[PDB]
RNA sequence: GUGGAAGUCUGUUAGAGUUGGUGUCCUACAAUACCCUCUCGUGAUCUAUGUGUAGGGGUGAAAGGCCCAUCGAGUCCGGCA
RNA sequence: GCGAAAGCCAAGGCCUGUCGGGAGCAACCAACGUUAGGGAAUUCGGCAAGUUAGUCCCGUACCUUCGGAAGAAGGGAUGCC
RNA sequence: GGUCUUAAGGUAGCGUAGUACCUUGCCGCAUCAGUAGCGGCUUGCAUGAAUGGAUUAACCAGAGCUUCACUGUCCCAACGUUGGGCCCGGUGAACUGUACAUUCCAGUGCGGAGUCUGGAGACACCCAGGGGGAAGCGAAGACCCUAUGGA
RNA sequence: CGAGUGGCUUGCUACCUCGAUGUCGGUUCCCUCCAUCCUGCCCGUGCAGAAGCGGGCAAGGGUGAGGUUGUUCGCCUAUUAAAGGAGGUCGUGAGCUGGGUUUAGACCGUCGUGAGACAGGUCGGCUGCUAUCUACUGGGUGUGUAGGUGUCUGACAAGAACGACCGUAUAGUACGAGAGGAACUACGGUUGGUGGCCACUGGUGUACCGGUUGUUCGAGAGAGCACGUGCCGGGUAGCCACGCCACACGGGGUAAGAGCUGAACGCAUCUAAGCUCGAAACCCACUUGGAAAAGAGACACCGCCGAGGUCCCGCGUACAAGACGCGGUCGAUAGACUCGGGGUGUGCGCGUCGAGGUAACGAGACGUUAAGCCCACGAGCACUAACAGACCAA
């Protein structure tokens, strides 16, 4: 009769090829609700440890009691919105209009870009404001970048650049807000965007594992019983039926597994601090010691230690925010042993 | 069912032979099914702590033997995680015969019982000697 | 808590509790100790154990 | 207690065989191999060397088995284009 | 050591079961080790793998051609000084 | 039926058989559930006495079944070891090849098309892979029929 | 009784293949159909409720585990929301398996004078090939768009990224004589599927440390071998699942269906024109891929005698070649060293004790000694090595 069974692995994350940018690119942003603000921030993964918390959940029969939570530590030092990019609505979607840059640049931003030496901030600002007047102004976002130099455990100094949308009240009000941010020096911090207890979508390029067999790449069975001793152990039965006479792309096959971009939804921000309180004894394995601006994200986070991860206010949360959760303990015990 | 208040790793399967932690006259039990459970192609139906399973009597009194009764998993060897991150595992896999209403067919429960089992099966619980 | 075997302070959100046949309880801080126990050894005869120390 | 019988037992002693793995190999190392496993292993035993039996004939504890990679009738050449 | 057994080692022989270099050396394959909880649910079938294991003491059913079954089963011991 | 064919007309046993079409026979045992197995029954499609019958200790790489023990056979896969695999130097074959050839979805056609027809898709070259298709390669089909064939 | 549809069954036909299109079942893995078993929305009821029965839309998702049998089928069990069916050369042997069918050996029954037969049973009985093309999965190099760096857009493409159940409140309430017994909504959990991650538990860990058997190096010390660890005990990192985290709602348009206004047809009428609602289905939302989209894109800056890039050197958050990412003295990229953090479990020697023994000798115990040995991690640290230098480029 042949029992039914769901196909192996999903066809929603494909093709399963290596990622173009090791740095994540959100393809969706939060809704323009509250006040003007940057809709994103980044950092570098460090490692994991647990923390004891006070049941915060109101609908829990344990609300108020202790509860051990697994947390991934993320060094989230300040970043710098070095420019405001404007997009115009067109019969072919949104298109970049112009940009407003600054003059104050991080000592090492030239390890990636050809830093501006001559730029007209006002013409740009004008062009935009004339677009808005005409009403062809599409959403507004800030070209930002990280300061890897601020993080000792991370070998790179070459900054990771990434555009992040600015959502706010009126377009006019958030356009200004943007310009204000940029003009300064672009410098902003995780606090200026997120608050512990809130949910955030964490993007990032997973851990790479090169080429892998279908068994691991797609979760197909291994050969069972006697079939496993005959010369086939981890190969699938067949690439398909006689007809159609071709191998359909939907059939599990070997390939590049890992190092794919993944936007992990509704992650709870357990705490945003600074110092070496979250650091573990001996040092986070294959990473180092933490001691500066950090974030504690509940659960796991795609990517391997040292990879740049990107935050965004959840675009489709399920729960209501239960701000600043009481942390009674954070384990500093060695991740060795 | 009601939340066990813990995370369980089913330590048992259909065909599994456990201990009958009560004085019903039933010594050994054979797991036949797991209430409310639906597995997946090739997956052996799994049962664990706090699961109400269907059983058949492998060893015991002549009149109890071969009978298809219902029961509840009171203990298992495979570890279970509590809210504070600790793990809890017992010395054996045992269950207690129960009825339609979930009241212990027996009078007394032999051995310890996981607290979590309380939060689902009162009468069973209120029949317990030691509740870990 | 203190591991009922070697006696070191068990790290919160860490350790396994073994329920004995009779009903008794033993909180182990690590696999190593559980396993020294399963061999039938007594923490007092192991010099690395806080108990012995 | 002695005695030490046996188509006796266990046994990769040597040696003989070839049950399973339907493993490895399958343009092979090999036109019948490799490995693990397994049978016999004082007897109707195994073996070297010599010698006898020749093709509708041998030999055959019989499978139509075997008679030089050739067998429900060997091989060579001839009948034969 | 029971041993012409295994394992280790002499004497003697050899590095010629005769292509090498490099990548923590991926998928996949050949030989193989270990796998928690469960324990034949796998499968035509427990195929493969595994379990048991040497010696001594205790003890040993049905059945039987009285030879045997039988090392039945089951239980205990086992070093060094 | 209460003899007739053709001489006699199945006795001891054994029996749903490695013989039983009906068939998964009926009953029982065993299991949660047993076309299996074992026991009893048995009118045996179509058992039975050296065409040997029944039975049977020992023996068996002989066929079926059950229990204890055991375990990666399975749940459900993981990690590791060694030799390949992958890159480099040297050595260096074979199978196969009417031609053309980047195909896919339909249709058509001697009714099972990369080549026809309509559309769709398609920048060229190369590396690895597991083998869907070339009714893939390998063998003038062993089955079947035909020959005024052979043995 | 009469009219049909399908092409799953069976038969008919002899068109296709006998210079071979590998058999039955199963298995594994992929796509589909609807005549729908469950799940969503509905209509009717011999609809009080609850549970059903019949019917309509609907194929998004699900449809599982076992006992006998080679079986397909089917019988049986216990779970279940339900344990639906069918097509894909009765999909799937250049994938597996080989129990059955269907060779040669053999038995039994029936038939036959016999050789031997069976649309009877039975035990045994082999699964070849290094992929040229095409196809697809992943990975590169070029060319086109026409100097470079960084950041995007989004034509379109993929998704099930989610499916379902149980429990609590609603409530012992509506309904009902009673027995019995719902719902909307709000919550908690489980299961299957999905993507990711290793603090925690668990596995591995032929890195590592210890115990110990046999033998060899005379003993001791310290070591080799016993299959690629002798065995046993423990086990860091990393990789993992049996571990952990995350996976909506809501809009828009419809089917069946419920209705509004409304005429042909003064009335009536959900429809003919118009309109309000309404499915797990459709579109959007969300994730992932996507300038080779030939309308071959957009923006900012840098540069055209110099911007940037290749080679070079130290290394990996990357990796089969290629690719990718980072560092290179204005330096913490790798190693040494020293700390830190970890794994074992108390080293050699010496001292005391030691059943004993005339003595020689003496297994072993305690102390020195959280000792000795060891680490795929971190920090400090320019001590060593990132030197020297080549090249392309409008
Ligand atoms: Cl398989
Ligand atoms: Cl079940
Ligand atoms: K043919
Ligand atoms: Mg095979
Ligand atoms: Mg760790
Ligand atoms: Mg199956
Ligand atoms: Mg620990
Ligand atoms: Mg003999
Ligand atoms: Mg022998
Ligand atoms: Mg001779
Ligand atoms: Mg013959
Ligand atoms: Mg010759
Ligand atoms: Mg196991
Ligand atoms: Mg079975
Ligand atoms: Mg075997
Ligand atoms: Mg019978
Ligand atoms: Mg029989
Ligand atoms: Mg006679
Ligand atoms: Mg054409
Ligand atoms: Mg022919
Ligand atoms: Mg013939
Ligand atoms: Mg003739
Ligand atoms: Mg073919
Ligand atoms: Mg329909
Ligand atoms: Mg579908
Ligand atoms: Mg089965
Ligand atoms: Mg077929
Ligand atoms: Mg099929
Ligand atoms: Mg084949
Ligand atoms: Mg095939
Ligand atoms: Mg082949
Ligand atoms: Mg066969
Ligand atoms: Mg057979
Ligand atoms: Mg046969
Ligand atoms: Mg051109
Ligand atoms: Mg060795
Ligand atoms: Na093979
Ligand atoms: Na093999
Ligand atoms: Na085929
Ligand atoms: Na005598
Ligand atoms: Na052999
Ligand atoms: Na002749
Ligand atoms: Na001739
Ligand atoms: Na007769
Ligand atoms: Na024999
Ligand atoms: Na294994
Ligand atoms: Na092919
Ligand atoms: Na028809
Ligand atoms: Na037909
Ligand atoms: Na042909
Ligand atoms: Na088949
Ligand atoms: Na459907
Ligand atoms: Na069945
Ligand atoms: Na087949
Ligand atoms: Na085959
Ligand atoms: Na809708
Ligand atoms: Na282009």
Swiss-Prot record, chain A:
This is Large ribosomal subunit protein uL3. InterPro entries: L3_arc_euk, Ribosomal_L3_dom_3_arc_sf, Ribosomal_uL3, Ribosomal_uL3_arc, Ribosomal_uL3_CS, Transl_B-barrel_sf. GO terms for molecular function: rRNA binding; structural constituent of ribosome. Residues 1-43, 150-169, 205-258, 311-337 are annotated as: Disordered. Belongs to the universal ribosomal protein uL3 family. It comes from the Archaea. Residues 21-30, 246-258 have a biased composition (Polar residues). SUPFAM superfamilies: Translation proteins (SSF50447). Keywords: Ribonucleoprotein, Ribosomal protein, RNA-binding, rRNA-binding. HAMAP family: Ribosomal_uL3_A. GO terms for cellular component: cytosolic large ribosomal subunit. Part of the 50S ribosomal subunit. Forms a cluster with proteins L14 and L24e. Interacts weakly with protein L13. The keyword Ribonucleoprotein applies. One of its GO terms (biological process) is translation. Pfam families: Ribosomal_L3 (PF00297). Residues 219-236 have a biased composition (Basic residues). One of the primary rRNA binding proteins, it binds directly near the 3'-end of the 23S rRNA, where it nucleates assembly of the 50S subunit.
From Swiss-Prot, chain B:
Keywords: Ribonucleoprotein, Ribosomal protein, RNA-binding, rRNA-binding. SMART domains: Ribosomal_L14 (SM01374). SUPFAM superfamilies: Ribosomal protein L14 (SSF50193). One of its GO terms (cellular component) is cytosolic large ribosomal subunit. It comes from the Archaea. GO terms for molecular function: large ribosomal subunit rRNA binding; structural constituent of ribosome. GO terms for biological process: translation. The keyword Endoplasmic reticulum does not apply. NCBIfam families: PRK08571.1 (NF006344), uL14_arch (TIGR03673). Forms part of two intersubunit bridges in the 70S ribosome. Binds to 23S rRNA. The L3/L14/L24e cluster may contact the 16S rRNA in 2 intersubunit bridges. Part of the 50S ribosomal subunit. Forms a cluster with proteins L3 and L24e. PANTHER family: 50S/60S RIBOSOMAL PROTEIN L14/L23, LARGE RIBOSOMAL SUBUNIT PROTEIN UL14. Belongs to the universal ribosomal protein uL14 family. HAMAP family: Ribosomal_uL14 (MF_01367). This is Large ribosomal subunit protein uL14. It comes from Haloarcula marismortui (strain ATCC 43049 / DSM 3752 / JCM 8966 / VKM B-1809) (Halobacterium marismortui).
Swiss-Prot record, chain C:
Binds 1 zinc ion per subunit. One of its GO terms (molecular function) is rRNA binding. A zinc finger (C4-type) spans 3-33. The keyword Protein biosynthesis does not apply. Zn(2+) binds at residues 3, 6, 29, 33. It comes from Haloarcula marismortui (strain ATCC 43049 / DSM 3752 / JCM 8966 / VKM B-1809). This is Large ribosomal subunit protein eL24. GO terms for cellular component: ribonucleoprotein complex; ribosome. It comes from the Archaea. Its cofactor is Zn(2+).
């Amino acid at each position: 009769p042949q029992p039914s069974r769901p196909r192996k692995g999903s066809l929603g994350f494909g093709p399963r090829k290596r990622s173009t940018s090791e740095t994540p690119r959100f393809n969706s942003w939060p809704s323009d609700d509250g006040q003007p603000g940057v809709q994103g921030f980044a950092g570098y993964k460090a490692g994991m440890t647990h923390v004891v918390l006070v049941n915060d959940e109101p609908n829990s029969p344990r609300e108020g009691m202790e509860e051990t939570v697994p947390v991934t530590v993320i060094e989230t030092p300040p970043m710098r919105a070095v420019a405001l990019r404007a997009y115009e609505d067109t019969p072919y979607g949104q298109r970049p209009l112009t940009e407003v840059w600054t003059d104050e640049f991080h000592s090492e931003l030239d390890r990636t870009l050809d830093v501006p030496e001559d730029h007209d901030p006002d013409a740009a600002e004008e062009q935009i404001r004339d677009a808005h007047e005409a009403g062809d102004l599409g959403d507004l976002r800030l070209i930002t970048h990280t300061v890897p130099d601020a993080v000792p455990s991370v070998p790179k100094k070459k900054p990771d650049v990434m555009e992040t949308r600015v959502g706010g009240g009126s377009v006019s009000d958030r356009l200004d807000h943007a310009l204000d941010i940029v003009e300064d020096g672009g410098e902003h911090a995780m606090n200026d965007i997120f608050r512990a207890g809130e949910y955030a979508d964490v993007a990032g390029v997973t851990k790479g594992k090169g080429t892998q067999g279908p068994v691991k790449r797609w979760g197909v069975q291994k050969r069972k019983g006697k079939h496993a001793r005959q010369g086939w152990r981890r190969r699938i039965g067949n690439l398909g039926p006689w007809n159609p006479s071709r191998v359909r792309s939907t059939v599990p096959q070997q390939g590049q597994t890992g190092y794919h971009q993944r936007t992990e939804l509704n992650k709870r921000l357990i705490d945003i601090g600074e110092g070496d309180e979250p650091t573990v004894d001996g040092g986070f394995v294959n990473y180092g010691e933490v001691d500066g601006p950090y974030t504690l994200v509940k659960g796991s986070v795609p990517g391997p230690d040292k990879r740049l991860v990107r935050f965004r206010p959840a675009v489709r949360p399920n729960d209501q925010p239960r701000l600043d959760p009481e942390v009674r303990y954070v384990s500093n015990e060695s991740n060795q042993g | 069912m009601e939340a066990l208040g813990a995370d369980v790793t089913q330590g048992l399967e259909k065909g599994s032979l456990i201990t009958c932690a009560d004085n019903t006259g039933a010594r050994e039990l054979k797991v036949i099914s797991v209430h409310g459970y639906s597995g997946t192609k090739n997956r052996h139906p799994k049962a664990g702590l706090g699961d109400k399973i269907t059983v058949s009597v492998t060893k015991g009194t002549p009149e109890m033997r071969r009978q298809v009764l219902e029961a509840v998993v009171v203990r298992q060897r495979k570890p279970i995680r509590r809210p504070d991150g600790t793990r809890v595992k017992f010395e054996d896999n045992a269950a207690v015969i129960v009825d339609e209403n979930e009241d212990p067919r027996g009078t007394e429960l032999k051995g310890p019982i996981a607290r979590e089992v309380a939060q689902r099966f009162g009468s069973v619980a209120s029949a317990a000697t030691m509740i870990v | 808590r203190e591991c009922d075997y070697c006696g070191t302070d068990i790290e919160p959100g860490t350790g396994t509790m073994f329920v004995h046949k009779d009903g008794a309880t033993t909180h182990f801080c690590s696999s190593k100790c559980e396993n020294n126990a399963d061999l039938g050894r007594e923490a007092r005869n192991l010099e690395w154990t806080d108990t012995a120390r």
